[PDB]
Design an enzyme around this catalytic site. Structure first.
Site, PDB file in Angstrom:
ATOM      1  N   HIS A  78      33.261   1.061  -9.194  1.00 28.76           N
ATOM      2  CA  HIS A  78      33.197   1.324 -10.839  1.00 28.76           C
ATOM      3  C   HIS A  78      31.523   1.724 -11.014  1.00 28.76           C
ATOM      4  O   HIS A  78      30.929   1.146 -11.573  1.00 28.76           O
ATOM      5  CB  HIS A  78      33.685   0.288 -11.610  1.00 28.76           C
ATOM      6  CG  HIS A  78      35.114   0.095 -11.662  1.00 28.76           C
ATOM      7  ND1 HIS A  78      35.768  -0.937 -11.178  1.00 28.76           N
ATOM      8  CD2 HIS A  78      36.190   0.941 -12.236  1.00 28.76           C
ATOM      9  CE1 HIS A  78      37.148  -0.703 -11.477  1.00 28.76           C
ATOM     10  NE2 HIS A  78      37.435   0.486 -12.034  1.00 28.76           N
ATOM     11  N   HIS A  82      32.523   7.449  -9.366  1.00 26.02           N
ATOM     12  CA  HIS A  82      33.954   7.382 -10.138  1.00 26.02           C
ATOM     13  C   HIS A  82      34.227   7.906 -11.505  1.00 26.02           C
ATOM     14  O   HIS A  82      35.217   8.695 -11.659  1.00 26.02           O
ATOM     15  CB  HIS A  82      34.480   5.642 -10.242  1.00 26.02           C
ATOM     16  CG  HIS A  82      35.566   5.484 -11.261  1.00 26.02           C
ATOM     17  ND1 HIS A  82      36.707   5.954 -10.819  1.00 26.02           N
ATOM     18  CD2 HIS A  82      35.744   4.846 -12.233  1.00 26.02           C
ATOM     19  CE1 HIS A  82      37.708   5.791 -11.809  1.00 26.02           C
ATOM     20  NE2 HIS A  82      37.034   5.074 -12.605  1.00 26.02           N
ATOM     21  N   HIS A 118      33.770   6.346 -19.571  1.00 28.74           N
ATOM     22  CA  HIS A 118      34.707   5.377 -19.980  1.00 28.74           C
ATOM     23  C   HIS A 118      34.736   4.157 -19.085  1.00 28.74           C
ATOM     24  O   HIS A 118      35.251   3.061 -19.577  1.00 28.74           O
ATOM     25  CB  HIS A 118      36.278   6.065 -19.541  1.00 28.74           C
ATOM     26  CG  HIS A 118      36.494   5.971 -17.983  1.00 28.74           C
ATOM     27  ND1 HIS A 118      36.303   7.037 -17.166  1.00 28.74           N
ATOM     28  CD2 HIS A 118      37.337   5.049 -17.183  1.00 28.74           C
ATOM     29  CE1 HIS A 118      36.458   6.474 -15.960  1.00 28.74           C
ATOM     30  NE2 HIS A 118      37.043   5.516 -15.701  1.00 28.74           N
ATOM     31  N   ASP A 119      33.787   4.140 -18.144  1.00 21.94           N
ATOM     32  CA  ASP A 119      33.445   2.874 -17.223  1.00 21.94           C
ATOM     33  C   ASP A 119      32.055   2.497 -17.558  1.00 21.94           C
ATOM     34  O   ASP A 119      31.561   1.731 -16.749  1.00 21.94           O
ATOM     35  CB  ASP A 119      33.836   2.919 -15.776  1.00 21.94           C
ATOM     36  CG  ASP A 119      35.475   2.702 -15.538  1.00 21.94           C
ATOM     37  OD1 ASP A 119      35.949   1.805 -16.378  1.00 21.94           O
ATOM     38  OD2 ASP A 119      36.663   3.276 -14.777  1.00 21.94           O
ATOM     39  N   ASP A 214      41.951   8.858 -14.604  1.00 26.64           N
ATOM     40  CA  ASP A 214      41.204   7.798 -13.923  1.00 26.64           C
ATOM     41  C   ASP A 214      41.662   7.393 -12.780  1.00 26.64           C
ATOM     42  O   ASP A 214      41.020   6.564 -11.818  1.00 26.64           O
ATOM     43  CB  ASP A 214      41.187   6.681 -14.995  1.00 26.64           C
ATOM     44  CG  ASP A 214      40.238   5.415 -15.008  1.00 26.64           C
ATOM     45  OD1 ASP A 214      39.575   5.008 -14.151  1.00 26.64           O
ATOM     46  OD2 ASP A 214      40.615   4.480 -15.704  1.00 26.64           O
ATOM     47  N   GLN A 247      48.710  -1.106  -1.216  1.00 28.59           N
ATOM     48  CA  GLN A 247      48.601   0.182  -1.761  1.00 28.59           C
ATOM     49  C   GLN A 247      50.162   0.817  -2.296  1.00 28.59           C
ATOM     50  O   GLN A 247      50.080   1.741  -3.254  1.00 28.59           O
ATOM     51  CB  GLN A 247      48.144   1.234  -0.627  1.00 28.59           C
ATOM     52  CG  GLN A 247      46.692   0.498  -0.546  1.00 28.59           C
ATOM     53  CD  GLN A 247      45.686   0.941  -1.580  1.00 28.59           C
ATOM     54  OE1 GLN A 247      45.042  -0.031  -2.270  1.00 28.59           O
ATOM     55  NE2 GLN A 247      45.508   2.271  -1.869  1.00 28.59           N
TER      56      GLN A 247
HETATM   57  C1  LIG Z   1      41.602  -6.210  -2.123  1.00 25.90           C
HETATM   58  O1  LIG Z   1      42.043  -5.009  -1.477  1.00 25.90           O
HETATM   59  C2  LIG Z   1      42.979  -4.104  -2.444  1.00 25.90           C
HETATM   60  C3  LIG Z   1      43.916  -3.382  -2.045  1.00 25.90           C
HETATM   61  C4  LIG Z   1      44.648  -2.753  -2.639  1.00 25.90           C
HETATM   62  C5  LIG Z   1      44.614  -2.913  -4.230  1.00 25.90           C
HETATM   63  C6  LIG Z   1      45.546  -1.998  -4.814  1.00 25.90           C
HETATM   64  N1  LIG Z   1      45.095  -0.605  -4.829  1.00 25.90           N
HETATM   65  C7  LIG Z   1      44.332   0.095  -5.807  1.00 25.90           C
HETATM   66  N2  LIG Z   1      43.835   0.964  -5.695  1.00 25.90           N
HETATM   67  C8  LIG Z   1      43.094   1.657  -6.632  1.00 25.90           C
HETATM   68  N3  LIG Z   1      42.690   2.861  -6.332  1.00 25.90           N
HETATM   69  C9  LIG Z   1      43.147   3.885  -5.001  1.00 25.90           C
HETATM   70  C10 LIG Z   1      42.576   3.684  -3.876  1.00 25.90           C
HETATM   71  O2  LIG Z   1      42.853   2.136  -3.442  1.00 25.90           O
HETATM   72  C11 LIG Z   1      41.610   3.708  -7.024  1.00 25.90           C
HETATM   73  C12 LIG Z   1      42.056   4.362  -8.037  1.00 25.90           C
HETATM   74  O3  LIG Z   1      43.466   5.111  -7.843  1.00 25.90           O
HETATM   75  N4  LIG Z   1      42.626   1.234  -7.774  1.00 25.90           N
HETATM   76  C13 LIG Z   1      43.308  -0.059  -7.855  1.00 25.90           C
HETATM   77  C14 LIG Z   1      44.116  -0.719  -7.344  1.00 25.90           C
HETATM   78  N5  LIG Z   1      44.407  -1.942  -7.735  1.00 25.90           N
HETATM   79  C15 LIG Z   1      43.500  -2.004  -8.917  1.00 25.90           C
HETATM   80  N6  LIG Z   1      43.003  -0.631  -9.068  1.00 25.90           N
HETATM   81  C16 LIG Z   1      41.957  -0.416 -10.227  1.00 25.90           C
HETATM   82  C17 LIG Z   1      40.592  -0.284  -9.800  1.00 25.90           C
HETATM   83  C18 LIG Z   1      42.559   0.823 -11.007  1.00 25.90           C
HETATM   84  C19 LIG Z   1      43.603  -3.356  -4.383  1.00 25.90           C
HETATM   85  C20 LIG Z   1      42.713  -4.217  -3.791  1.00 25.90           C
HETATM   86 MG   LIG Z   2      37.743   0.804 -17.053  1.00 22.20          MG
HETATM   87 ZN   LIG Z   3      37.975   4.351 -14.521  1.00 20.88          ZN
END
Ligand SMILES: COc1ccc(CNc2nc(N(CCO)CCO)nc3c2ncn3C(C)C)cc1
Ligand SMILES: [Mg+2]
Ligand SMILES: [Zn+2]
Length: 290
Positions: A78, A82, A118-119, A214, A247
Site C-alpha cells: 500500500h 499501488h 485513496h490509500d 483498486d 488466491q
Molecule cells: C499472506 O499471504 C496472502 C495470500 C493471499 C491473500 C489473498 N489475496 C489478496 N490479493 C490481493 N491482491 C492480488 C494479488 O495477491 C492485490 C489486489 O488485487 N489483495 C488482497 C488479498 N487479500 C486481501 N487483499 C487486499 C490488499 C485487497 C492474502 C495474503
Molecule cells: Mg484502502
Molecule cells: Zn487500494
C-alpha cells in the site's frame, strides 16, 4: 521548489501511446518515480482535465509530488506504486474500456484524483471506514495546500460537487462497503435494469469502478500478478503452502463477479475479466500441486 519539482516541471511529457498507459496490461516495475509522475500528468492531460479545469502546470506537478510523498515507501504493497497503478487502471478503463463517455467531466476529474489519493498515508494492513476517512482527510489536506490547488479553476458549485464525489469514491474502496453494496449492483445487472441516468445507480457504478481499479493487480499478466501477490504477502506477513488456494479464494469471493459485471456495463473492459480468469487458472493449477 525542491530539485524534484524543478526536474518534473521541466520534462517533456511523452504521449499516452509511448507511455503504454492505455493498456490494461501496464506494469510500473521498470519505471522510476519521475517516470510515474510523467505518466500521471499524461493521464490528466488526455482526459482533458488540464484544459477543461485550467490547471497550471507547476501546480499539477507539485500536487502529484505531494501525493507521492504522502505514501510510505516502507509499506510493501500500500504505497505510491499501488495508487499509481490504480489510477492507470482508471485511465485505461475510461479510454480503452470506453467508460469515459458514460460519465461527466467532473466525475472523471473526481475518479482520477480519488484513484491516486485513496490509500494516502497507509501504514500497512497489520499496523493499527476509519482508514478510508483518514485517506480522504489526507487527500483534502493536499488539495488545499498552498501551490497544490489543482481544483482552483472550478467554480464553487463544481468544487463542492467534485469534493463529494472524491469522498464517496475513496470511501467506496473499503472492501466492507463494497461487499455490502455490490449485491444491488449485481441484482440490477442480472435483471437488465441497470441505468446510469439514475443518480443512485451512477453513484453505485462509480463505487464499483473504484473497487475494480483498486483490485486490478489481480487482472495483470501472470508474471506481473505473481510479483504483486508477493508484495501483498510481504505486507500481510513480514509487515507459502496455502497461498495458491487463498488466491483462488480471493478471486472467487471478491474479484470475478465484479469484472463480469463491469464487462456487462462495457464490453471493452473484457480484458480485465479475461486477465482475472487466466490468473485464477494459474493459481488453481498451483493449488492442485499443493
Ligand atoms: C499472506 O499471504 C496472502 C495470500 C493471499 C491473500 C489473498 N489475496 C489478496 N490479493 C490481493 N491482491 C492480488 C494479488 O495477491 C492485490 C489486489 O488485487 N489483495 C488482497 C488479498 N487479500 C486481501 N487483499 C487486499 C490488499 C485487497 C492474502 C495474503
Ligand atoms: Mg484502502
Ligand atoms: Zn487500494
Amino acid at each position: 521548489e525542491t530539485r524534484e519539482l524543478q526536474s518534473l516541471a521541466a520534462a517533456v511529457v511523452p504521449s499516452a501511446q509511448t507511455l503504454k498507459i492505455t493498456d490494461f496490461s501496464f506494469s510500473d516495475f521498470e519505471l522510476s518515480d519521475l517516470e510515474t509522475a510523467l505518466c500521471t500528468i499524461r493521464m490528466f492531460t488526455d482526459l482533458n482535465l488540464v484544459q477543461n479545469f485550467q490547471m497550471k502546470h507547476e501546480v499539477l506537478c507539485r500536487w502529484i509530488l505531494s501525493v507521492k510523498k504522502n505514501y510510505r515507501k516502507n509499506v510493501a504493497y500500500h504505497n505510491w506504486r499501488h495508487a499509481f497503478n490504480t489510477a492507470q487502471c482508471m485511465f485505461a478503463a475510461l479510454k480503452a474500456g470506453k467508460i469515459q463517455n458514460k460519465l461527466t467531466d467532473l466525475e472523471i476529474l473526481a475518479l482520477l484524483i480519488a484513484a491516486l489519493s485513496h490509500d494516502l498515508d497507509h501504514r500497512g494492513v497489520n499496523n493499527s471506514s476509519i482508514m478510508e476517512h483518514h485517506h480522504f482527510d489526507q487527500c483534502l489536506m493536499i488539495l488545499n495546500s498552498p501551490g497544490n490547488q489543482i481544483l482552483s479553476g472550478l467554480s464553487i458549485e463544481e468544487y463542492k460537487t467534485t469534493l463529494k464525489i472524491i469522498k464517496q469514491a475513496i470511501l467506496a474502496t473499503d472492501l466492507a462497503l463494497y461487499i455490502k453494496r455490490r449485491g444491488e449492483f449485481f441484482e440490477l445487472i442480472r435483471k437488465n435494469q441497470f441505468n446510469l441516468e439514475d443518480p443512485h445507480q451512477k453513484e453505485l457504478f462509480l463505487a464499483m469502478l473504484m473497487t475494480a481499479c483498486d483490485l486490478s493487480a489481480i487482472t495483470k499478466p501472470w508474471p506481473i500478478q505473481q510479483r504483486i501477490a508477493e508484495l501483498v504477502a510481504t505486507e500481510f506477513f513480514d509487515q507459502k503452502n496455502k497461498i495458491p488456494s487463498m488466491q483462488v479464494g480471493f478471486i472467487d469471493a471478491i474479484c470475478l463477479q465484479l469484472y463480469e459485471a463491469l464487462t456487462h456495463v462495457s464490453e471493452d473492459c473484457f480484458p480485465l475479466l479475461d486477465g482475472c480468469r487466466k490468473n485464477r487458472q494459474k493459481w488453481q493449477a498451483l493449488a492442485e500441486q499443493q
